[PDB]
DNA sequence: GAGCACTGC
């Protein structure tokens, strides 16, 4: 055991802390406690009966509305606005199958519709079912929900379908995503939403009584949400005979979902796309004749294949396939040369280059922008080159979508973001490197890593279609067919990649209390060891008790749309009156940083982050300072100038503001706050006390702790609490800095790439970790009295301070349990405030002097 | 000294 710095507090402070604790100890309506007791006392059969009675609205129909919309449909089908657009819709393959889909839905609870791009299933199926219900005089019984994986798709599809019906958004078609909606009319309507919106609405309507038809789209992508939804339908559907479900998939292991729901009926609907010829590395080199130079394994892969194709290609072409760097993106000049090849030959059209990540995008951009080869210098001024990455601004401007100036060919250098998330319509040419990056978690070492990997066959098939939107395209794959043969069908289903705390907790509000039993019923069952890791984390933050039963705190956290650790932090910031900085930190961790990282500007970005961090040694407080400065720029009508100078996305900043406001409104509704405004002065009295903000941030990121031992940019010797050496990620505001006031840090995420990095950190003080943490005990190790935290970090502490801190923790636990069971704002002059004051006083001792 | 991509009444 190694003893750390002395945490003893002065007698004058100890005296006041004990006065404040004893004032707190002299303390003597709750509808939340009755709801929590009721949830725990009902079995699943009762839960089902009670939710039926509470969501009965769809038991009510409106015969005059039914008659009126039937009449209006028949009439307006003779108007000349529709009946053009109806003849155009009938060109969509899905409309050929309308009557068979109507009949199959009528005869089956679940059907599956399988189709590729252009088939029209997403826009036409909801309309077919809606117009049939209206035609049959059933209109007001029809409420159709169609889930989408992505926000932008929910909006765009809803707007398109609304236009096809000659309606403004909000009549028969609507959309709902998080914090934005254009709601359709209540009945005889189609709503497009993100899958997560529907999952959240299950808390109020767990058996889905409030819709007649559920359409799950893009299930072949195997997001957590749709995988979970399908598992929940196995619980729900036996209790909902009248509910209809239409599953929708691209043709990517479509049979999995058919098998998963008994053997349900499956429609295969043909696509509409222009042909895209597929070339592989052998064909590419046979065209360009590019010459390379500056385990194997690989040799066992390529040599049998070179035998099979020996007569179809020149031997010098085949011989290049034996070079391991011929495949993938390992040689960027090879890729640049293929770009030049397409620029010289082939018809006009844009080039879309799929590369794994930021680093290789930067390399290809620099080669094309500042070429060393004469062939490149000829082409430099004839290309319009756009790097595309989730951290770069290019996707948030218009230029990459519009056609380039005449005589210039657009070249887009992209990550997987342009596979689905981002769409460029004038692309005729795709260079598919076959490489992406993936995050991998190793259960046994508890290490998350980011590794360059081969893409899957489904990825290659998706990238190929990206060349066929306008005219016949070409897809150049930078690997051999032998490499393709070795690729997996699909990416690992993301639920096998996921941390499970939030899911397990949310299931409790649906009365699925045994997560081992339910998650085993998914299409791919997560590792039971990851479920246990999820349950143990939830017991550690006391969202579950030691029996695994939901606590009052756990119920509150399940009702916030954020990971429970950060939900806890937000709730603590309400009690400790730091709401605004803490919701900023939580929202940035839950969503993302507002900072861009544009090509070549990375040291400039580092300097901006430094200035926003204001020497507070926290990436989390840095984000909040950014938000404070962003508000000032709006108040100054300097918003654009501010975002430009500081490399900030105003779109991300505005979304972070919306999320902070959602957290504030929910806490207000749950009676933890007197005001719903996250800036409200009452909720923020402590928001400029930095040691208090470090304490609350620590309370949320605990137990992820690190300890720095080191001197010198500076070199760092630092280890997380598990003993593994780490460094701050270079993008972090603590990388390379020296002179930390404290050697301790908390962090949200640790990740291995070239080193084991902390991607974000806040410098913290021991006494804060001790007050809000666990594994706390006082004792004597050598002859020195100590106080420890997590049974890991042992601090010199005298008896007087130890006994007061241990007593403080007991009262804090008592206060937290009571606020969770009986939510109410902490009154300024009351008993509970005196315990808050005791803690503020102890934490203020670490203020920067 | 480095950052695949989604998302929440």
Q: What are phi and psi of A706, to 5 degrees?
A: -140, 155
For the packed helices A619-635 and A579-590, what is the interaxial angle rounded to 10 degrees? 110
Q: Is A251 exposed, middle or buried (0-12, 13-18, 19+ CB in 10 A)?
A: middle
* Distance of alpha carbon A525 from alpha carbon A527, whole angstroms: 7
Cβ neighbour number for residue A39 with a 10 Å cutoff: 14
Cα maximum dimension of chain A: 95
* Distance of alpha carbon A621 from alpha carbon A628, whole angstroms: 11
Q: What are phi and psi of A179, to 5 degrees?
A: 60, 20
Cβ neighbour number for residue A153 with a 10 Å cutoff: 20
How many Å from the CA of A751 to C1' of B7? 21
Sign, Cα dihedral of A399, A402, A408, A410: positive
* Distance of alpha carbon A496 from alpha carbon A490, whole angstroms: 13
The nucleotide closest to A595 (CA, C1' atoms): B3
Integer CA distances (angstroms), A756 to A32, A203, A567, A595, A619, in order: 44, 39, 27, 23, 18
Cβ neighbour number for residue A246 with a 10 Å cutoff: 24
Distance of alpha carbon A150 from the chain centroid = 11
Q: Is strand B in 7 Å reach of the CB of A570?
A: no
Tokens matching residue A226: 């749709």
Q: Residues 491-510 of chain A: which lie with beta carbon within 7 Å of strand B?
A: 494, 502, 506
Q: Is A737 exposed, middle or buried (0-12, 13-18, 19+ CB in 10 A)?
A: middle
Q: Is strand B in 7 Å reach of the CB of A722?
A: no
3-state secondary structure of A726: strand
How many Å from the CA of A495 to C1' of B5? 14
Q: Is A849 exposed, middle or buried (0-12, 13-18, 19+ CB in 10 A)?
A: exposed
* Distance of alpha carbon A391 from alpha carbon A495, whole angstroms: 25
Resolution, Å (one decimal): 2.2
Q: Is A133 exposed, middle or buried (0-12, 13-18, 19+ CB in 10 A)?
A: buried
Beta bridge partners, A780, equal A785
Which of A697, A690, A686, A694 lies closest to A836 in space, CA to CA?
A: A686
Which of A659, A535, A542, A507 lies closest to A590 in space, CA to CA?
A: A659
Determine contact, residues A727/A717, Cβ cutoff 8 Å: no
Determine contact, residues A355/A389, Cβ cutoff 8 Å: no
How many Å from the CA of A732 to C1' of B2? 10
* Distance of alpha carbon A430 from alpha carbon A274, whole angstroms: 14
3-state secondary structure of A27: coil
Distance of alpha carbon A215 from the chain centroid = 22
Determine contact, residues A468/A373, Cβ cutoff 8 Å: no
Segment holding A517, helix H or strand E: helix A515-519
Q: Is strand B in 7 Å reach of the CB of A602?
A: yes
How many Å from the CA of A598 to C1' of B1? 16
* Distance of alpha carbon A97 from alpha carbon A119, whole angstroms: 11
Tokens matching residue A627: 């938000």
Tokens matching residue A664: 């504030």
Which of A466, A357, A490 lies closest to A416 in space, CA to CA?
A: A357
Q: Is A282 exposed, middle or buried (0-12, 13-18, 19+ CB in 10 A)?
A: buried
Q: CB-based contacts of A241: which residues, under 8 Å, 6+ apart? A: A109
* Distance of alpha carbon A524 from alpha carbon A512, whole angstroms: 18
Q: Is strand B in 7 Å reach of the CB of A777?
A: no
CA dihedral A329, A331, A336, A340 (to 10 degrees): -110
Determine contact, residues A844/A693, Cβ cutoff 8 Å: no
Q: Experimental method for this entry?
A: X-ray
Q: Is strand B in 7 Å reach of the CB of A456?
A: no
Determine contact, residues A127/A164, Cβ cutoff 8 Å: yes
Which of A224, A241, A233, A236 lies closest to A261 in space, CA to CA?
A: A233
How many Å from the CA of A797 to C1' of B8? 44
Q: Which long-range contacts (CB under 8 A, 24 or more apart) does A194-198 make?
A: A194/A147, A194/A148, A194/A149, A194/A150, A194/A151, A194/A154, A194/A225, A195/A147, A195/A148, A195/A149, A195/A223, A195/A225, A195/A226, A195/A229, A196/A225, A197/A147, A198/A145, A198/A147, A198/A229
Whose tokens are 């991607």? That residue is A759
* Distance of alpha carbon A385 from alpha carbon A470, whole angstroms: 20
Integer CA distances (angstroms), A565 to A385, A543, A605, A692, A731, in order: 42, 9, 29, 18, 23
Integer CA distances (angstroms), A434 to A19, A269, A437, A454, A584, in order: 67, 28, 11, 6, 38
3-state secondary structure of A76: helix
Beta bridge partners, A719, equal A707, A725
Which of A421, A384, A377, A389 lies closest to A403 in space, CA to CA?
A: A384
Cβ neighbour number for residue A514 with a 10 Å cutoff: 12
* Distance of alpha carbon A772 from alpha carbon A298, whole angstroms: 53
* Residues, chain A: 849
φ/ψ region of A370 (left if φ > 0, alpha if ψ in -120 to 50, else beta) reads beta
Whose tokens are 């502490």? That residue is A797
Q: Is strand B in 7 Å reach of the CB of A601?
A: no
Determine contact, residues A801/A17, Cβ cutoff 8 Å: no
Q: CB-based contacts of A700: which residues, under 8 Å, 6+ apart? A: A565, A566, A568, A569, A570, A572, A582, A585, A586
Determine contact, residues A258/A530, Cβ cutoff 8 Å: no
Whose tokens are 């299933």? That residue is A121
Q: Is strand B in 7 Å reach of the CB of A417?
A: yes
Determine contact, residues A414/A354, Cβ cutoff 8 Å: yes
A614-637 burial: b if 16+ Cβ within 10 Å, else e: eebbbbbbbbbbbbeebeebeeee
* Distance of alpha carbon A703 from alpha carbon A416, whole angstroms: 33
* Distance of alpha carbon A549 from alpha carbon A552, whole angstroms: 10
Tokens matching residue A709: 């031992």
Strand B: positions under 7 A of a protein C-beta atom: 1-9
* Distance of alpha carbon A687 from alpha carbon A579, whole angstroms: 7
3-state secondary structure of A578: coil
* Distance of alpha carbon A626 from alpha carbon A348, whole angstroms: 44
How many Å from the CA of A367 to C1' of B1? 22
Q: What are phi and psi of A758, to 5 degrees?
A: -90, 120
Determine contact, residues A777/A791, Cβ cutoff 8 Å: yes
How many Å from the CA of A760 to C1' of B9? 31
How many Å from the CA of A367 to C1' of B6? 31
Q: Is strand B in 7 Å reach of the CB of A609?
A: no
A216-242 burial: b if 16+ Cβ within 10 Å, else e: bbbbbbbbbbbbbbbbbbebbbebbee
Q: Residues 136-155 of chain A: which lie with beta carbon within 7 Å of strand B?
A: 149-152
3-state secondary structure of A781: coil
Determine contact, residues A490/A536, Cβ cutoff 8 Å: no
Q: Residues 673-692 of chain A: which lie with beta carbon within 7 Å of strand B?
A: none
Q: Is strand B in 7 Å reach of the CB of A651?
A: no
Q: What are phi and psi of A707, to 5 degrees?
A: -135, 125
Residue A544: asked if its preceding bond is cis (omega within 30°), the reply is no
Q: Is A18 exposed, middle or buried (0-12, 13-18, 19+ CB in 10 A)?
A: middle
Which of A471, A468, A478, A539 lies closest to A504 in space, CA to CA?
A: A539
* Distance of alpha carbon A251 from alpha carbon A636, whole angstroms: 52
Determine contact, residues A764/A737, Cβ cutoff 8 Å: no
How many Å from the CA of A307 to C1' of B6? 42
Integer CA distances (angstroms), A703 to A353, A366, A536, A544, A604, in order: 42, 42, 12, 17, 33
Q: CB-based contacts of A461: which residues, under 8 Å, 6+ apart? A: A252
Q: Is A485 exposed, middle or buried (0-12, 13-18, 19+ CB in 10 A)?
A: exposed
* Distance of alpha carbon A163 from alpha carbon A156, whole angstroms: 11
Segment holding A763, helix H or strand E: strand A762-764
The nucleotide closest to A450 (CA, C1' atoms): B4
Whose tokens are 């005449």? That residue is A406
For the packed helices A619-635 and A690-701, what is the interaxial angle rounded to 10 degrees? 120
Whose tokens are 């009156």? That residue is A577
A744-746 and A762-764 strand pairing: antiparallel
Tokens matching residue A479: 């690997």
Ordered DSSP codes for A797-821: --HHHHHHHHHHHHHHHHHHHHHHH
* Distance of alpha carbon A721 from alpha carbon A214, whole angstroms: 47
Ordered DSSP codes for A684-714: GTTTT-HHHHHHHHHHHHTT-EEEE------
Q: C-alpha angle A631/A634/A635, rounded to 5°?
A: 85
* Distance of alpha carbon A39 from alpha carbon A769, whole angstroms: 34
Provide the 8-state DSSP code for A826.
P
Integer CA distances (angstroms), A260 to A81, A264, A521, A524, in order: 43, 9, 10, 10
Sign, Cα dihedral of A736, A742, A748, A749: positive
Determine contact, residues A283/A475, Cβ cutoff 8 Å: no
Which of A322, A301, A312, A354 lies closest to A487 in space, CA to CA?
A: A301
* Distance of alpha carbon A105 from alpha carbon A215, whole angstroms: 11
Which of A208, A210, A264, A214 lies closest to A235 in space, CA to CA?
A: A208
Q: Residues 747-766 of chain A: which lie with beta carbon within 7 Å of strand B?
A: 751, 753-755, 757
How many Å from the CA of A143 to C1' of B5? 32
Which of A528, A463, A466 lies closest to A496 in space, CA to CA?
A: A528
Q: Which residue is nearest to nucleotide B4 (CA to C1')?
A: A437
Ordered DSSP codes for A262-287: TT--EEEE------EEEE-HHHHHHH
Determine contact, residues A602/A391, Cβ cutoff 8 Å: no
How would you write A481-511 as a 3-class SS string? HHHHHHCCCCCCCHHHHCCCHHHHHHHHHCC
* Distance of alpha carbon A747 from alpha carbon A769, whole angstroms: 13
* Distance of alpha carbon A273 from alpha carbon A767, whole angstroms: 64
* Distance of alpha carbon A95 from alpha carbon A269, whole angstroms: 10
Sign, Cα dihedral of A770, A772, A777, A778: positive
3-state secondary structure of A298: helix
How many Å from the CA of A246 to C1' of B9? 23
């Amino acid at each position: 055991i190694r003893l750390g710095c002395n945490v003893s507090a002065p007698s004058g402070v100890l005296e006041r802390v004990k006065e404040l604790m004893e004032d707190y100890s002299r303390a003597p309506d709750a509808k939340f406690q009755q709801q929590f007791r009721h949830l725990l006392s009902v079995n699943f059969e009762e839960f089902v009966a009670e939710t039926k009675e509470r969501n009965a609205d769809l038991d009510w129909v409106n015969p005059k509305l039914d008659e009126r919309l039937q009449l209006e449909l028949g009439q307006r089908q003779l108007e000349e606005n529709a009946k053009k657009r109806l003849e155009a819709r009938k060109k969509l393959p899905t409309m050929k199958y309308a009557d068979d889909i109507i009949q199959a839905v009528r005869e089956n609870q679940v059907i599956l519709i399988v189709g590729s791009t252009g088939c029209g299933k997403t826009t036409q199926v909801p309309q077919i079912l809606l117009d049939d219900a209206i035609s049959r005089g059933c209109a007001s019984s029809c409420r159709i929900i169609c889930t989408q994986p992505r926000r932008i798709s929910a909006i765009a599809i809803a707007e398109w379908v609304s236009y096809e019906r000659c309606e403004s958004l909000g009549n028969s078609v609507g959309y709902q995503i998080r914090l934005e909606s254009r709601k359709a009319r209540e009945r005889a309507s189609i709503t497009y939403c993100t899958t997560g919106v529907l999952l959240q609405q299950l808390q109020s309507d767990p058996l889905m009584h409030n819709l007649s038809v559920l359409i799950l789209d893009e299930i072949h992508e195997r997001s957590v949400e749709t995988d979970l939804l399908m598992g929940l339908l196995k619980v729900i559907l036996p209790h909902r005979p009248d509910l209809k479900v239409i599953l929708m998939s691209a043709t990517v292991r479509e049979q999995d979902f058919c098998d998963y729901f008994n053997n349900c009926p499956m429609f295969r609907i043909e696509g509409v796309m222009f042909p895209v010829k597929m070339l592989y590395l052998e064909d590419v080199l046979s065209k360009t004749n590019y010459e390379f130079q500056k385990r194997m394994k690989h040799e066992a892969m390529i040599e049998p294949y070179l035998r099979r194709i020996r007569n179809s290609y020149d031997s010098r072409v085949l011989d290049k396939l034996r070079l391991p760097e011929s495949e993938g993106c390992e040689d960027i000049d090879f890729i640049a040369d293929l770009v030049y090849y397409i620029c010289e030959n082939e018809p006009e059209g844009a080039i879309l280059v799929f590369l794994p990540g930021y680093d290789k995008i930067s390399q290809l951009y620099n080669i094309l922008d500042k070429p060393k080869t004469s062939k490149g210098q000829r082409w430099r001024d004839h290309m319009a080159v756009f790097p595309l990455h989730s951290l770069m601004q290019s996707g948030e401007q218009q230029a990459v979508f519009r056609r380039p100036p005449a005589g210039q060919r657009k070249v887009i250098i992209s990550t997987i973001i342009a596979e689905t998330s981002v769409t460029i319509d004038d692309v005729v040419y795709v260079i598919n490197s076959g490489r992406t990056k993936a995050t991998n978690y190793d259960i046994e070492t508890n290490i998350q890593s980011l590794d360059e990997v081969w893409v899957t066959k489904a990825n290659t098939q998706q990238r190929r279609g990206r060349a066929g939107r306008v005219r016949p395209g070409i897809c150049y794959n930078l690997f051999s067919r032998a490499r393709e043969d070795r690729m997996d069908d699909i990416p690992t289903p993301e639920i096998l990649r996921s941390k499970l705390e939030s899911i397990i907790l949310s299931l409790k509000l649906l009365h699925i209390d045994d997560p081992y039993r339910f998650l085993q019923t998914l299409i791919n069952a997560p590792n039971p060891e990851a479920i246990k890791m999820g349950v143990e984390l939830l017991k550690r933050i006391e969202a579950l008790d030691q029996t695994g039963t939901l606590t009052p705190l756990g119920m509150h956290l399940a009702k916030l749309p954020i990971d429970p650790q950060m939900g806890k932090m937000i709730l603590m910031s309400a009690l400790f009156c730091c709401l605004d900085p803490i919701t900023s930190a939580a929202a940035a961790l839950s969503f993302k940083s507002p900072f861009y990282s544009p090509l070549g500007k990375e040291s400039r970005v580092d300097e901006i982050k430094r200035r926003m961090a204001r020497n507070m040694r926290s990436d989390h407080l840095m984000v909040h300072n950014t938000i404070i400065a962003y508000r000032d720029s709006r108040y100054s009508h300097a918003e654009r100038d501010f975002c430009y100078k500081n490399f900030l996305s105003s779109m991300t900043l505005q979304q972070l503001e919306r999320m902070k406001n959602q957290f504030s409104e929910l806490l207000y509704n749950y009676k933890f706050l007197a005001s719903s405004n996250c800036k409200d002065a009452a909720s923020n009295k402590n928001s400029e006390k930095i040691p208090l903000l470090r304490a609350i941030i620590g309370a949320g990121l605990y137990p992820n702790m690190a300890h720095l031992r080191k001197s010198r940019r500076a070199i760092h010797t630092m280890a997380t609490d598990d003993g593994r050496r780490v460094n701050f990620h270079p993008s972090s505001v603590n990388s390379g800095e020296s002179g930390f006031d404290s050697a301790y840090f908390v962090y949200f995420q640790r990740q291995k790439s070239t080193d084991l990095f902390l991607l974000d950190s806040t410098m913290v003080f021991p006494m804060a970790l001790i007050i809000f943490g666990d594994g706390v005990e006082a004792g004597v190790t050598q002859n020195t009295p100590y106080l420890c935290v997590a049974k890991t970090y042992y601090f010199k502490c005298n008896r007087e301070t130890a006994d007061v801190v241990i007593q403080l923790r007991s009262n804090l636990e008592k206060l937290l349990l009571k606020k969770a069971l009986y939510p109410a704002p902490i009154e300024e002059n009351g008993y509970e405030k005196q315990l808050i004051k005791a803690i503020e006083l102890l934490l203020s001792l670490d203020e920067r002097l």
